[PDB]
Amino acid sequence: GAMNSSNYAELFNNDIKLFVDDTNVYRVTVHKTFEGNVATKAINGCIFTLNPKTGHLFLKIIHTSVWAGQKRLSQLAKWKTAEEVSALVRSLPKEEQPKQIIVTRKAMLDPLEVHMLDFPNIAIRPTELRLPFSAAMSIDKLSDVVMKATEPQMVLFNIYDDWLDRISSYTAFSRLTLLLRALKTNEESAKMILLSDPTITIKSYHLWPSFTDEQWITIESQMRDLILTEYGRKYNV
Amino acid sequence: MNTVPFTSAPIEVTIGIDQYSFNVKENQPFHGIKDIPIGHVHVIHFQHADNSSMRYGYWFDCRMGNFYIQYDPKDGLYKMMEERDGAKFENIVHNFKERQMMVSYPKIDEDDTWYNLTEFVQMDKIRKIVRKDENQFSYVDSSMTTVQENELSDPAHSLNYTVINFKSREAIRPGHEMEDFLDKSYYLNTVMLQGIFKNSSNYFGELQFAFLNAMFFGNYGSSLQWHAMIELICSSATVPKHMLDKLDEILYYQIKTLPEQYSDILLNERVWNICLYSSFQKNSLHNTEKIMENKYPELL
Ligand SMILES: CC(C)CSCCC(=O)Nc1cccnc1
């Protein structure tokens, strides 16, 4: 059934699983037409497919040409997501295929179930967690590869950089979700926190800065403050 | 006009014959049902006064043999049996009719209700859903499960309705996932009508039989089957116009006949709201929509 706070350690056991987040697949800007009507212009998107134990991210870039001449794009986007996740599973060797796929939005359940009928033993699960994966496009290197794409493309990343050499996958996921929640709540401030100090750089092969263990503690504290800060600025508390 | 005689009525029971019902008192001189219209299937059904658990009964067609009812005190139920000695049977019936100990099938001349509920129902198809080949009539009760229910446990006592499953490889063509799930026309027309049922008459016969078992026995798996067969049509964008017009008549008479006080358990809110207001066929079931809105506006 659903993944929630109770069964949270299940994410870091040795059964292969993937989160799938579709909130950045179909992206538009809304604008006025010369006649004063409103229209949308699609921009490139992405499927965010993440193994929470290993940090392996399968970033399928969705190029705007996939929407050309199509109707009901928000519905199509869920089916296209499920088509691409199914294609990814089929592409993986059997011993690398997931046992479970957890969708971050319940509207993905039927599309994914139907596309995965050939895999009756892969469980398709919802979650009650409100995960901040929509903020993936606030990671500069991810946003850059999506916007530059001229055709459909899959790009592979490790979203944990080298953190697993020093911390467990539970702690790495907690750091990732904290960083993403902060970027989602106040992107400007979050990015200021991450880069204020010019002496800590992002390695060419990494997504996040090369913080020492002690600097990560300061960073994580600054992100919690920000999230609480914004939560007050919002509710006036 | 045919007759189903009863050897006796040793236990107090409510007896149904099609949409009609009467009460027989324990050991009340009762000798059966006469004037049964020829040309239709019929169902004779029972609910005991001391244990309303288990409604049960028998589907039969008097053109296929001479049938009677006899209570079995060991198994505790009224059983249908066939009498092969035609002269014995005629002699028994004539004597019971002379003593006027039978109830007359009480059909009003104007009234086409039973025809309308059984238009496509054939005994030969019933006997393939309810498998007991040594008898010409078919037993059904409240508790019998369907083959599909048994997949999700005695196979000989199952209702072998055609399995319908919208998230199944049978229903979804590889490469047409979104198309086939959102528009079920290929599953309706190619898989089910052309492939399995052969024609719409057999599809409607099974739909009507499923409804009648749901209504008369409270059979839950039959209600599931009835709604699935409605939903498969309503969720198809491409349905022959004659099938839609016929479906509207079928459902109208089913909704008209349903006891008002069983609507809460025999009608699935989601299916009916989707079928009448959201589906491709939301505007194709005018008679059914009107009776539903005037008789069960709460459900909607
Ligand atoms: C008085 C004697 C000559 C029998 S005349 C009663 C006819 C009959 O059997 N009616 C009936 C109605 C309902 C249930 N069982 C039976």
mmCIF file of N, CA and C in Angstrom, chain B residues 19-99:
data_model
loop_
_atom_site.group_PDB
_atom_site.id
_atom_site.type_symbol
_atom_site.label_atom_id
_atom_site.label_comp_id
_atom_site.label_asym_id
_atom_site.label_seq_id
_atom_site.Cartn_x
_atom_site.Cartn_y
_atom_site.Cartn_z
ATOM 1 N N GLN B 19 -40.848 -12.063 -11.018
ATOM 2 C CA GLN B 19 -40.947 -10.866 -10.189
ATOM 3 C C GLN B 19 -42.067 -10.947 -9.154
ATOM 4 N N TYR B 20 -42.759 -12.073 -9.047
ATOM 5 C CA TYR B 20 -43.867 -12.270 -8.121
ATOM 6 C C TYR B 20 -43.409 -13.114 -6.933
ATOM 7 N N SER B 21 -44.110 -12.965 -5.799
ATOM 8 C CA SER B 21 -43.812 -13.692 -4.539
ATOM 9 C C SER B 21 -45.080 -13.914 -3.702
ATOM 10 N N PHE B 22 -45.133 -15.020 -2.955
ATOM 11 C CA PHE B 22 -46.277 -15.380 -2.085
ATOM 12 C C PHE B 22 -45.738 -16.138 -0.878
ATOM 13 N N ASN B 23 -46.515 -16.175 0.204
ATOM 14 C CA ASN B 23 -46.117 -16.838 1.468
ATOM 15 C C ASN B 23 -46.870 -18.170 1.560
ATOM 16 N N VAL B 24 -46.190 -19.274 1.880
ATOM 17 C CA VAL B 24 -46.850 -20.587 2.118
ATOM 18 C C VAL B 24 -46.548 -20.942 3.580
ATOM 19 N N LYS B 25 -47.559 -21.275 4.383
ATOM 20 C CA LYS B 25 -47.405 -21.601 5.819
ATOM 21 C C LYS B 25 -46.893 -23.039 5.928
ATOM 22 N N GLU B 26 -46.209 -23.360 7.019
ATOM 23 C CA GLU B 26 -45.711 -24.703 7.298
ATOM 24 C C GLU B 26 -46.825 -25.730 7.133
ATOM 25 N N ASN B 27 -46.610 -26.785 6.314
ATOM 26 C CA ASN B 27 -47.590 -27.864 6.012
ATOM 27 C C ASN B 27 -48.922 -27.302 5.497
ATOM 28 N N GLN B 28 -48.917 -26.168 4.801
ATOM 29 C CA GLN B 28 -50.157 -25.609 4.208
ATOM 30 C C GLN B 28 -50.393 -26.362 2.899
ATOM 31 N N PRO B 29 -51.570 -26.990 2.674
ATOM 32 C CA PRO B 29 -51.864 -27.659 1.415
ATOM 33 C C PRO B 29 -51.504 -26.731 0.244
ATOM 34 N N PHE B 30 -50.333 -26.936 -0.351
ATOM 35 C CA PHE B 30 -49.848 -26.146 -1.506
ATOM 36 C C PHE B 30 -49.365 -27.119 -2.578
ATOM 37 N N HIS B 31 -49.771 -26.955 -3.830
ATOM 38 C CA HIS B 31 -49.379 -27.926 -4.870
ATOM 39 C C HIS B 31 -48.735 -27.309 -6.115
ATOM 40 N N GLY B 32 -48.204 -26.092 -6.064
ATOM 41 C CA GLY B 32 -47.402 -25.540 -7.143
ATOM 42 C C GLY B 32 -47.979 -24.334 -7.866
ATOM 43 N N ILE B 33 -47.397 -24.061 -9.023
ATOM 44 C CA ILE B 33 -47.632 -22.855 -9.806
ATOM 45 C C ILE B 33 -48.046 -23.266 -11.216
ATOM 46 N N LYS B 34 -49.191 -22.756 -11.674
ATOM 47 C CA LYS B 34 -49.731 -23.052 -12.992
ATOM 48 C C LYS B 34 -49.752 -21.780 -13.844
ATOM 49 N N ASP B 35 -50.134 -21.949 -15.122
ATOM 50 C CA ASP B 35 -50.298 -20.845 -16.082
ATOM 51 C C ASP B 35 -48.992 -20.089 -16.333
ATOM 52 N N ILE B 36 -47.865 -20.797 -16.274
ATOM 53 C CA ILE B 36 -46.560 -20.179 -16.508
ATOM 54 C C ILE B 36 -46.365 -19.924 -17.992
ATOM 55 N N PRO B 37 -46.105 -18.678 -18.404
ATOM 56 C CA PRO B 37 -45.990 -18.384 -19.831
ATOM 57 C C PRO B 37 -44.867 -19.134 -20.510
ATOM 58 N N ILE B 38 -45.197 -19.689 -21.640
ATOM 59 C CA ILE B 38 -44.239 -20.367 -22.483
ATOM 60 C C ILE B 38 -43.543 -19.325 -23.352
ATOM 61 N N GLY B 39 -42.254 -19.526 -23.554
ATOM 62 C CA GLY B 39 -41.463 -18.686 -24.432
ATOM 63 C C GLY B 39 -40.381 -17.925 -23.738
ATOM 64 N N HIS B 40 -40.326 -17.984 -22.408
ATOM 65 C CA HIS B 40 -39.337 -17.254 -21.655
ATOM 66 C C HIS B 40 -38.644 -18.221 -20.709
ATOM 67 N N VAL B 41 -37.415 -17.889 -20.334
ATOM 68 C CA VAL B 41 -36.886 -18.522 -19.113
ATOM 69 C C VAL B 41 -37.695 -18.042 -17.907
ATOM 70 N N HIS B 42 -37.597 -18.792 -16.808
ATOM 71 C CA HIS B 42 -38.234 -18.401 -15.572
ATOM 72 C C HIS B 42 -37.309 -18.759 -14.413
ATOM 73 N N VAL B 43 -37.570 -18.162 -13.267
ATOM 74 C CA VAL B 43 -36.818 -18.477 -12.052
ATOM 75 C C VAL B 43 -37.813 -18.698 -10.926
ATOM 76 N N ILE B 44 -37.634 -19.791 -10.184
ATOM 77 C CA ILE B 44 -38.460 -20.069 -9.027
ATOM 78 C C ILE B 44 -37.526 -20.094 -7.818
ATOM 79 N N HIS B 45 -37.854 -19.276 -6.830
ATOM 80 C CA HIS B 45 -36.904 -18.949 -5.768
ATOM 81 C C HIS B 45 -37.549 -18.968 -4.398
ATOM 82 N N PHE B 46 -36.686 -19.049 -3.390
ATOM 83 C CA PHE B 46 -37.108 -19.451 -2.062
ATOM 84 C C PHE B 46 -36.363 -18.662 -1.006
ATOM 85 N N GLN B 47 -37.096 -18.257 0.021
ATOM 86 C CA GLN B 47 -36.465 -17.773 1.254
ATOM 87 C C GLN B 47 -37.216 -18.350 2.435
ATOM 88 N N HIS B 48 -36.527 -19.142 3.236
ATOM 89 C CA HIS B 48 -37.213 -19.803 4.338
ATOM 90 C C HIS B 48 -37.555 -18.794 5.427
ATOM 91 N N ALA B 49 -38.666 -19.051 6.115
ATOM 92 C CA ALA B 49 -39.147 -18.114 7.115
ATOM 93 C C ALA B 49 -38.252 -18.100 8.342
ATOM 94 N N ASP B 50 -37.598 -19.219 8.649
ATOM 95 C CA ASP B 50 -36.808 -19.322 9.870
ATOM 96 C C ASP B 50 -35.341 -18.978 9.666
ATOM 97 N N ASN B 51 -34.874 -18.917 8.418
ATOM 98 C CA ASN B 51 -33.494 -18.522 8.135
ATOM 99 C C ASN B 51 -33.515 -17.786 6.799
ATOM 100 N N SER B 52 -33.666 -16.466 6.870
ATOM 101 C CA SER B 52 -33.560 -15.636 5.682
ATOM 102 C C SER B 52 -32.155 -15.663 5.089
ATOM 103 N N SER B 53 -31.186 -16.263 5.782
ATOM 104 C CA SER B 53 -29.893 -16.521 5.161
ATOM 105 C C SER B 53 -30.074 -17.518 4.023
ATOM 106 N N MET B 54 -29.441 -17.235 2.892
ATOM 107 C CA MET B 54 -29.588 -18.069 1.707
ATOM 108 C C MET B 54 -30.964 -17.881 1.068
ATOM 109 N N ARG B 55 -31.084 -16.910 0.174
ATOM 110 C CA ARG B 55 -32.081 -17.024 -0.868
ATOM 111 C C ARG B 55 -31.480 -17.984 -1.895
ATOM 112 N N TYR B 56 -32.297 -18.862 -2.480
ATOM 113 C CA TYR B 56 -31.793 -19.776 -3.498
ATOM 114 C C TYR B 56 -32.929 -20.040 -4.475
ATOM 115 N N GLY B 57 -32.592 -20.561 -5.647
ATOM 116 C CA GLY B 57 -33.650 -20.855 -6.619
ATOM 117 C C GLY B 57 -33.115 -21.493 -7.884
ATOM 118 N N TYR B 58 -34.018 -21.637 -8.867
ATOM 119 C CA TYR B 58 -33.759 -22.450 -10.039
ATOM 120 C C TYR B 58 -34.217 -21.708 -11.279
ATOM 121 N N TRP B 59 -33.318 -21.579 -12.254
ATOM 122 C CA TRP B 59 -33.643 -21.100 -13.590
ATOM 123 C C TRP B 59 -34.025 -22.295 -14.461
ATOM 124 N N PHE B 60 -35.132 -22.156 -15.202
ATOM 125 C CA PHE B 60 -35.668 -23.243 -16.008
ATOM 126 C C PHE B 60 -36.479 -22.683 -17.172
ATOM 127 N N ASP B 61 -36.770 -23.574 -18.110
ATOM 128 C CA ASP B 61 -37.558 -23.279 -19.304
ATOM 129 C C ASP B 61 -38.412 -24.512 -19.512
ATOM 130 N N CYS B 62 -39.729 -24.332 -19.387
ATOM 131 C CA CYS B 62 -40.678 -25.439 -19.408
ATOM 132 C C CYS B 62 -40.714 -26.162 -20.752
ATOM 133 N N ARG B 63 -40.171 -25.567 -21.806
ATOM 134 C CA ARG B 63 -40.076 -26.275 -23.075
ATOM 135 C C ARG B 63 -39.035 -27.378 -23.053
ATOM 136 N N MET B 64 -38.162 -27.402 -22.056
ATOM 137 C CA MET B 64 -37.052 -28.344 -22.022
ATOM 138 C C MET B 64 -37.318 -29.576 -21.168
ATOM 139 N N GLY B 65 -38.483 -29.678 -20.552
ATOM 140 C CA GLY B 65 -38.792 -30.838 -19.744
ATOM 141 C C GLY B 65 -39.879 -30.501 -18.755
ATOM 142 N N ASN B 66 -40.340 -31.542 -18.049
ATOM 143 C CA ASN B 66 -41.355 -31.419 -17.006
ATOM 144 C C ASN B 66 -40.649 -31.324 -15.651
ATOM 145 N N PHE B 67 -40.778 -30.177 -14.986
ATOM 146 C CA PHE B 67 -40.035 -29.920 -13.747
ATOM 147 C C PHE B 67 -40.988 -29.777 -12.569
ATOM 148 N N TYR B 68 -40.551 -30.243 -11.390
ATOM 149 C CA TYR B 68 -41.331 -30.103 -10.172
ATOM 150 C C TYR B 68 -40.402 -29.782 -9.010
ATOM 151 N N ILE B 69 -41.007 -29.405 -7.877
ATOM 152 C CA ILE B 69 -40.283 -29.078 -6.640
ATOM 153 C C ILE B 69 -40.659 -30.077 -5.556
ATOM 154 N N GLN B 70 -39.658 -30.510 -4.793
ATOM 155 C CA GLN B 70 -39.889 -31.425 -3.685
ATOM 156 C C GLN B 70 -38.909 -31.030 -2.600
ATOM 157 N N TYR B 71 -39.416 -30.895 -1.386
ATOM 158 C CA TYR B 71 -38.563 -30.541 -0.254
ATOM 159 C C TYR B 71 -37.750 -31.764 0.149
ATOM 160 N N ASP B 72 -36.462 -31.547 0.405
ATOM 161 C CA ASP B 72 -35.566 -32.571 0.941
ATOM 162 C C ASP B 72 -35.266 -32.292 2.412
ATOM 163 N N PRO B 73 -35.748 -33.116 3.349
ATOM 164 C CA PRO B 73 -35.484 -32.836 4.779
ATOM 165 C C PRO B 73 -34.053 -33.088 5.209
ATOM 166 N N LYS B 74 -33.241 -33.757 4.394
ATOM 167 C CA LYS B 74 -31.855 -33.993 4.797
ATOM 168 C C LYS B 74 -30.993 -32.787 4.464
ATOM 169 N N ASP B 75 -31.071 -32.311 3.206
ATOM 170 C CA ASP B 75 -30.358 -31.109 2.788
ATOM 171 C C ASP B 75 -31.091 -29.821 3.137
ATOM 172 N N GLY B 76 -32.348 -29.894 3.568
ATOM 173 C CA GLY B 76 -33.031 -28.736 4.105
ATOM 174 C C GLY B 76 -33.401 -27.695 3.060
ATOM 175 N N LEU B 77 -33.737 -28.123 1.857
ATOM 176 C CA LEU B 77 -34.169 -27.128 0.876
ATOM 177 C C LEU B 77 -35.168 -27.714 -0.104
ATOM 178 N N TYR B 78 -35.896 -26.802 -0.741
ATOM 179 C CA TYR B 78 -36.768 -27.170 -1.848
ATOM 180 C C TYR B 78 -35.906 -27.422 -3.082
ATOM 181 N N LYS B 79 -35.995 -28.627 -3.647
ATOM 182 C CA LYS B 79 -35.198 -28.996 -4.807
ATOM 183 C C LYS B 79 -36.046 -29.099 -6.076
ATOM 184 N N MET B 80 -35.499 -28.618 -7.176
ATOM 185 C CA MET B 80 -36.103 -28.885 -8.478
ATOM 186 C C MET B 80 -35.648 -30.247 -8.986
ATOM 187 N N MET B 81 -36.579 -30.969 -9.585
ATOM 188 C CA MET B 81 -36.316 -32.254 -10.211
ATOM 189 C C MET B 81 -37.071 -32.316 -11.528
ATOM 190 N N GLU B 82 -36.594 -33.176 -12.434
ATOM 191 C CA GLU B 82 -37.255 -33.459 -13.704
ATOM 192 C C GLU B 82 -37.988 -34.795 -13.600
ATOM 193 N N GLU B 83 -39.247 -34.824 -14.056
ATOM 194 C CA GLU B 83 -40.020 -36.053 -14.181
ATOM 195 C C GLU B 83 -39.965 -36.487 -15.644
ATOM 196 N N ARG B 84 -39.421 -37.683 -15.882
ATOM 197 C CA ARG B 84 -39.290 -38.186 -17.248
ATOM 198 C C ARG B 84 -40.560 -38.883 -17.737
ATOM 199 N N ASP B 85 -41.368 -39.427 -16.830
ATOM 200 C CA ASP B 85 -42.631 -40.073 -17.190
ATOM 201 C C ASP B 85 -43.685 -39.000 -17.466
ATOM 202 N N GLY B 86 -43.859 -38.664 -18.740
ATOM 203 C CA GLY B 86 -44.770 -37.589 -19.113
ATOM 204 C C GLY B 86 -46.214 -37.832 -18.714
ATOM 205 N N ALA B 87 -46.645 -39.094 -18.698
ATOM 206 C CA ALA B 87 -48.036 -39.408 -18.385
ATOM 207 C C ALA B 87 -48.290 -39.366 -16.886
ATOM 208 N N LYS B 88 -47.325 -39.839 -16.102
ATOM 209 C CA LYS B 88 -47.373 -39.637 -14.663
ATOM 210 C C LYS B 88 -47.511 -38.152 -14.345
ATOM 211 N N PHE B 89 -46.652 -37.332 -14.953
ATOM 212 C CA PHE B 89 -46.630 -35.905 -14.662
ATOM 213 C C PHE B 89 -47.947 -35.236 -15.020
ATOM 214 N N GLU B 90 -48.445 -35.465 -16.244
ATOM 215 C CA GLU B 90 -49.713 -34.853 -16.642
ATOM 216 C C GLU B 90 -50.838 -35.266 -15.701
ATOM 217 N N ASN B 91 -50.816 -36.520 -15.247
ATOM 218 C CA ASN B 91 -51.851 -37.011 -14.343
ATOM 219 C C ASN B 91 -51.760 -36.331 -12.984
ATOM 220 N N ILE B 92 -50.541 -36.146 -12.481
ATOM 221 C CA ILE B 92 -50.341 -35.426 -11.228
ATOM 222 C C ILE B 92 -50.864 -33.999 -11.345
ATOM 223 N N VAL B 93 -50.453 -33.288 -12.391
ATOM 224 C CA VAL B 93 -50.837 -31.888 -12.520
ATOM 225 C C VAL B 93 -52.355 -31.757 -12.620
ATOM 226 N N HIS B 94 -52.977 -32.546 -13.504
ATOM 227 C CA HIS B 94 -54.428 -32.463 -13.669
ATOM 228 C C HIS B 94 -55.179 -32.654 -12.345
ATOM 229 N N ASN B 95 -54.747 -33.603 -11.507
ATOM 230 C CA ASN B 95 -55.378 -33.797 -10.198
ATOM 231 C C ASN B 95 -55.198 -32.574 -9.293
ATOM 232 N N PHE B 96 -53.996 -31.983 -9.272
ATOM 233 C CA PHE B 96 -53.772 -30.808 -8.430
ATOM 234 C C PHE B 96 -54.578 -29.612 -8.927
ATOM 235 N N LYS B 97 -54.733 -29.490 -10.244
ATOM 236 C CA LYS B 97 -55.533 -28.405 -10.793
ATOM 237 C C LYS B 97 -57.006 -28.604 -10.484
ATOM 238 N N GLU B 98 -57.475 -29.846 -10.504
ATOM 239 C CA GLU B 98 -58.903 -30.136 -10.221
ATOM 240 C C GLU B 98 -59.222 -29.762 -8.768
ATOM 241 N N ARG B 99 -58.269 -29.916 -7.850
ATOM 242 C CA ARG B 99 -58.471 -29.624 -6.403
ATOM 243 C C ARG B 99 -58.140 -28.154 -6.086
#
